[PDB]
UniProtKB/Swiss-Prot annotation:
Lineage, highest ranks first: Bacteria, Pseudomonadati, Pseudomonadota, Gammaproteobacteria, Enterobacterales
Chain positions found as N6-acetyllysine: K90, K107
PANTHER family recorded: TWO-COMPONENT RESPONSE REGULATOR (PTHR43228), TWO-COMPONENT RESPONSE REGULATOR ARR22 (PTHR43228:SF1)
Protein name in UniProt: Chemotaxis protein CheY
Outcome of substituting T85I: Impairs chemotaxis
One BP annotation, GO: phosphorelay signal transduction system
Gene: cheY
UniProt GO MF annotations: acetyltransferase activity; magnesium ion binding; phosphorelay response regulator activity
Source organism: Escherichia coli (strain K12)
Annotated Response regulatory domain residues: 5-122
């Protein structure tokens, strides 16, 4: 399972590299990157991914739109999706909860905070 394949979606390169190094630090070296929602969806179609980490607000297709699209796609309807945000607000959290987000994490975060979140979802998703 440390071989689970992650797709990290963020408009900003620096932010994608940060998330990538935190995963490596934790033992997950099978990570991939996407620049926006469309790029994410195109990549996911090829298959083989087992976890998606996405920022909430990307230019064009935003995290919430990406999520509702993954959830509706039969082939990828069960993919775990961690939402990343700068501002946690009851309004955004519930909306994401209702659309199917597996969880949310406020940035900036450390590998210890990310791991805590990963686990809770892994055990939630019984995987």
């Amino acid at each position: 399972d440390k071989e689970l394949k992650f797709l990290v979606v963020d408009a900003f390169s620096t932010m994608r590299r940060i998330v990538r190094n935190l995963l490596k630090e934790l033992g997950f070296n099978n990570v991939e990157e996407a620049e926006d929602g469309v790029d994410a969806l195109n990549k996911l179609q090829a298959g083989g991914y087992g976890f998606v980490i996405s920022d909430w607000n990307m230019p064009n297709m935003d995290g919430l739109e990406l999520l509702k699209t993954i959830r509706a796609d039969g082939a990828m309807s069960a993919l775990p999706v961690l939402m990343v945000t700068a501002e946690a607000k009851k309004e955004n959290i519930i909306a994401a909860a209702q659309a199917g987000a597996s969880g949310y994490v406020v940035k900036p975060f450390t590998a210890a905070t990310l791991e805590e979140k990963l686990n809770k979802i892994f055990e939630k998703l019984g995987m």
